[PDB]
């Protein structure tokens, strides 16, 4: 009765800088060439896939249906059903879940999903006119603060959430800034290599002139080590502040696509595929809001019991970099600083981009993934929660 | 090993008029509302429930992850998971099916799920630096117009697409208007014989000078028999229209929510339940985007095949009523013009709060069947998409 | 032309369009157009012919989306013809009463025969401000203020409201909460007084608002019978809330929409068209003072005596005073200093009780004061404006010029 | 009781900033401040004398309470100093320096200051209160620069309009304005290279987070590029009838000037060979249809002439406002100026158009132009169909 599902490709963009090369290209935009090399790279006729999921967190001014943007404008037939996806931080994985579940009931055989996120395009809210006071200062909010990352209950930014974690597991700012380094040193090993060329889907953005073809992230050469311990904290300004702008997470713009199948339809179109891999488990779990960092921590025992597995068989591990004193939490509660944790970088220098990072981080996972080996990908979201997937990666099916 | 799922009760507020009772209730807060009431009625101890899905289709500026408010609002534990769901019109009734996969897949035994729309909290958009010119005018987009009611592809209102599905199926003016007039009529008479007392969930509107419990639905009793025929069309004004505001659809704020069951869950707690049922399957379709309006005509043949039953074994049909323009049609290509269909009004006389319609005709389809009856709650949304889901009513499970 | 010996002025017509209330009957009506109004009338009341009046000075505090030249379009509106010259003029709250000084200095140059002075103000439209894209953040809150606040009634050096500077006048003088409550009551009395035996009728312009499906004609003052004397001494500190707060909504002024204008001549115009005027007078004297900005209240004590002396008379000549009620705390003040307490300042009301469209108030504390002059009488229009200025003007009623 | 004479005893400007340029975080109160302390410091009169500050400022939103009062207070002056911001559009500083010199003339006052400001990057965009927007739908924003500053209200459009309607009557032809636009250019760099503006600029200090930079030169005036000025599009006109262009019309910018006058007495006493010193001969004003604006210093300079007692002949320098090369092309048809000295150091098409300033602004800029007991003259033309003209005398001394 109930099947497994099978990832058969991922295929991200660059992760572009806040208003930086992606200004003028909507979520959507960036979600169907993520969409399309996917399909391409997949090898299943586009025909048999039917259902299009892509998180996306803020939804201000991107249009009706963005996950239907999307698909209409990877060139997929109008008869493909879609839905947009919102879990926060977590909403590109949540979409790879949820996609996998019409392939584990039957409805379907295959599903394209990911995530999409323009930071720079959200708008600020000018509340209409019977919200308006008669007269008065009138205060504007940016919606990348009130929508993305203002904790409701606690009325305070997510970087505060961070600081009351890194108090709590006695994280200091020397090793926020060392795992910083890090990422980003990481991160100039990997694309001096050019390790995610064949991950990245290149983004041709027309304008004036001619044409750009972004091909590269934009953030991960920016490291400045002497700065690094000078940097000034940016949300904690009381005298015990230990986040600052470069051991944080950066706001980017960029999506990610996977294309997903039943076990017929890799054995019949994707056996010798690059991402190959089965979707083990899954999990959501949630604490309060304030302690989102350490979710993680919660949903990753979860999925690996789901599994069948421990700890000590997962090759590598990707946790979404959205602190320094994040990653660094949920190391020392799973007892995981001597595992291989992010090789090629994180959010911290690849950027990210809220509703596509979720997905991104299973992308990169999986073109980290000798066939045998079981991979995770864990990203916590705002709220007080997260998700984890627990893959394996294939040489083939049977 | 797929499991069933059962609807164990049905709950919604009542629906506002724009810029009406809910002007200062965010629709998170009125999502609570309605999820305390259906977690009441279940008669589930509250920690069996461990996901909150809820409908919303513009989110700008409601707060992070809005389901999540929803949930915490009601007072359910940090502990339970949420998703926010966006399938544009159709994304209560969605948030329903995806509640259901879980029990479906056995990973829970309980999941609340509906959806909410505060249409006159729904702010304007102003772009932020990098995308505002040097000098010269700038306009501001509505939400309601850019997220909600445009079309992507055509770039032309929904109610432009309601037009040009009344042209091709020969729907005329005169048939709309009478189709609208008998919706009131249906209303009222609901209302005067207090058909919705047992789904409706009051609110508590917390103003300066005290409180006011709002408890009748706002709409029903502004129709003016006289003034229908004379309307001028709303959205086609060159002559040749016909949709107006009187037989189409209003702008609404309001809630709705359901308590999910696996069968254990249901004979345990639920039995005798007013509300109890069993979903009997779900189905989503789309086509061309001009075409959204005739697109539960593809979507109910479906989920009728996946149930096993023919349109003749469907006790009571609700379908909502965008526009009459909407039903007409669906009614012509099904040959359900003499079923029993929206008895109890509709989206034209009871309103229309986006992310809540789905699950709204749900709990009002489920307080109009008799035991052993099925039901068909259809819905279609912006992208040229629908979703559907028979249903079939008891009063205890063996 | 010029001219060797500084010449007299006079006024020859008054006009002003009833007072309307903030977000009221004149929401629709820009402030020019209610410039006009109040222009039309006064040149049809004066009987001077058109063609003699060369310059529109209108007195205007908040521009911002009045459109190009407002003072221009007052004129244009009114019928007059594009070779009269125009200028806006922003003394802030004083701007009306020095438009009237600057309209009269081109006839005591000889420059000019006949003018047209005022001021006017539509307090509903003033906008809110959206700083460009370049003095935008590139992210996070945006605080967007309100015009009335930012360009009206705010402090530059002291960053508060004129409230709070009419708060610390009404301590250094010793005006108590109880002066302040029997001073706006008074206003209250002596305007419903006033409206009860129509003393505005002459004085004001009506105005027609074109609105959806039919016309409205305003011709009555909106706020005056808003007097609730009961819940007075009960009211609110508007501005000052740590327990020395004294000023309130009731005795402070508050903001409205309107316009007024007047006809000013050379002796030799008034005699050939304006001998039997109703608003006929001299103007003989004007002048401008200015202190320390969070003084501003008291700058009236400093331009009168000025005024009165250029003018060679005393205190006790003057028939009637008209200062502007900004605060009830500064029109006792500047009776405690200049010892009017037994004059007649304000008798049938001020802004307190007929509202303060502020580009408006100097012009039309002057169209009350010449209404209510008898032949020969000495009048006094004097008012205070931000930044830590005011000006005072003395005129002489007249039946004839000769 | 008699009528005396007003002397101008010191002008500067502030350097003019291009649009969105070195000004953006100086208000138009603060380079007001800087040109009237320059000025104040130059004309040698003790600062107890001078009794008013007349401003001219033709956009005033979010620039704070009284304008005037605050370039008065910033530039050090007493509190007990008189000001007033005034509004004439584009004649704006020289309306305020004639109104400055009508007090000294009717004897009101012995000292005054008098001049201009206009930040244009810091005009703000309008947002209506609750009760003036719609309920729901598209909301349309004003530009402050658009809808106050260069838009007729009579004839809905832009000024540049009545720039082409001008050219047309007068038969002024892209090519025409494109080399009085070129020659505009080429005087401006001239002057720059000779140190010409020197004496008269007054250098602002912008703080910044990251050091202080010191402003001393105009921004602007080395973009021409002869070959790209006859292959631009027309700025305001695309109906294939257009002639004026960015390159031929004014920039925006921001910007001030400022002058201190006196009477007689205060000249004799504190200001004999002062750089600037001169006699303020005459002002007219003028008018006519709103769509002729550009035509008007035409009727004005004969009025001013007229009351200053000299004929045209007599006047060595001319600074007429640029504010499109066609505008200046027909007042020197119909005035007969076309061998006349003209903008001989370039105008606003180089040298930048602080709507509030450049009135006050060009007179500094003649001031330094004169030879001792030479006839100057500014005019300058303003929205609605006005213009403003100063008839000057340079002067070495008084007697
Ligand atoms: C940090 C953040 C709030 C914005 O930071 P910002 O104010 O734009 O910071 P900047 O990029 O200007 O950098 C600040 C300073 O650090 C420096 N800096 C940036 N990256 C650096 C690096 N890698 N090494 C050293 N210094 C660095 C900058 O150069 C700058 O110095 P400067 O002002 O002298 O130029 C935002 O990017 C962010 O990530 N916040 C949270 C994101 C989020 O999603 N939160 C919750 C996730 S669940
Ligand atoms: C109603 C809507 C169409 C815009 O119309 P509107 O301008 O708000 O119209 P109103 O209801 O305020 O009034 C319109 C007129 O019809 C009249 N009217 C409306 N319903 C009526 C009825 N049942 N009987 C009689 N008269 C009626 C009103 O009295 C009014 O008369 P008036 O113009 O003489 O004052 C708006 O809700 C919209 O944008 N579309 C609906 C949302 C939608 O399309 N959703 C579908 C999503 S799939
Ligand atoms: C003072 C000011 C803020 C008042 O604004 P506001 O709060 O909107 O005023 P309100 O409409 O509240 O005034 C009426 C309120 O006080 C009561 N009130 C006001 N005047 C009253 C009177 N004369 N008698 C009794 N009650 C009175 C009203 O009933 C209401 O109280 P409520 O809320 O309990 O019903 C406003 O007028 C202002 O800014 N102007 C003062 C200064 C100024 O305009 N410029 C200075 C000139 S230089
Ligand atoms: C201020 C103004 C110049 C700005 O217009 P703009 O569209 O930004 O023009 P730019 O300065 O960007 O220049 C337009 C084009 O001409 C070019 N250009 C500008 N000045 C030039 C010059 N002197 N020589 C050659 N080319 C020039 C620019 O490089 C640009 O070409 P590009 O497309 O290759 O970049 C003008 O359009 C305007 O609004 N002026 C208002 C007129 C006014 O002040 N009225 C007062 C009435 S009294």
């Known amino acids: 009765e109930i099947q497994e599902a099978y990832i058969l490709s991922g295929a991200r963009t660059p992760t572009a800088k806040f208003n930086g090369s992606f200004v003028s290209v909507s979520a959507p935009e960036l979600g169907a060439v993520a969409i399309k090399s996917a399909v391409s790279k997949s090898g299943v006729p586009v025909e048999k896939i039917t259902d299009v999921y892509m998180g996306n967190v803020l939804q201000g001014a991107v249009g009706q249906a963005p996950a239907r943007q999307a698909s209409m404008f990877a060139g997929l037939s109008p008869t493909v059903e879609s839905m947009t996806v919102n879990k926060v931080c977590a909403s590109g994985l949540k979409a790879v879940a949820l996609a996998a579940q019409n392939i584990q009931l039957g409805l379907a055989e295959a599903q394209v999903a990911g995530g999409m996120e323009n930071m720079s395009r959200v708008?600020?809210?000018?509340?209409?006119?019977?919200?308006?006071?008669?007269f008065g200062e009138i205060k504007l909010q940016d919606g990348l603060i009130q929508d993305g990352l203002w904790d409701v209950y606690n009325q305070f930014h997510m970087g505060i959430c961070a600081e009351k974690t890194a108090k709590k597991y006695e994280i200091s700012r020397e090793e926020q800034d060392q795992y910083a380094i890090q990422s980003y040193q990481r991160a100039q090993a990997a694309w001096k290599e050019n390790k995610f060329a064949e991950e990245i889907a290149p983004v041709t953005v027309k304008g004036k002139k001619g044409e750009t073809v972004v091909e590269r992230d934009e953030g991960?050469?920016?490291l400045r080590i002497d700065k690094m311990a000078t940097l000034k904290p940016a949300f904690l300004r009381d005298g015990t502040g230990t986040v600052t702008a470069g051991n944080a997470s950066t706001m980017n713009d960029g999506a990610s696509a996977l294309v997903l199948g039943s076990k017929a339809i890799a054995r019949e179109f994707a056996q010798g595929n690059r991402a190959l891999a089965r979707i083990v488990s899954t999990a959501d779990a949630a604490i309060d809001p304030?302690?989102?960092?350490?979710?993680?921590?919660?949903?990753?025992?979860?999925?690996?019991?789901?599994?069948?597995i421990t700890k000590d068989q997962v090759a590598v591990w990707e946790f979404n970099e959205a602190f320094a004193a994040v990653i660094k939490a949920n190391?020392?509660?799973?007892?995981?600083?001597?595992?291989?944790?992010?090789?090629?970088?994180?959010?911290?220098?690849l950027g990210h981009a809220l509703g596509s990072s979720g997905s991104r981080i299973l992308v990169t996972l999986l073109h980290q993934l000798q066939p045998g080996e079981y991979g995770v990908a864990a990203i916590c979201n705002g709220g007080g929660a997260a998700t984890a997937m627990v893959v394996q990666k294939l040489d083939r099916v049977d």
């Open 123 to 134: 708008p600020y809210y000018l509340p209409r006119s019977t919200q308006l006071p008669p």
């Open 331 to 349: 190391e020392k509660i799973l007892g995981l600083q001597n595992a291989r944790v992010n090789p090629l970088g994180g959010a911290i220098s």
């Open 290 to 308: 304030v302690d989102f960092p350490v979710a993680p921590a919660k949903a990753v025992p979860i999925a690996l019991e789901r599994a069948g």
């Open 220 to 222: 991960y050469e920016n």
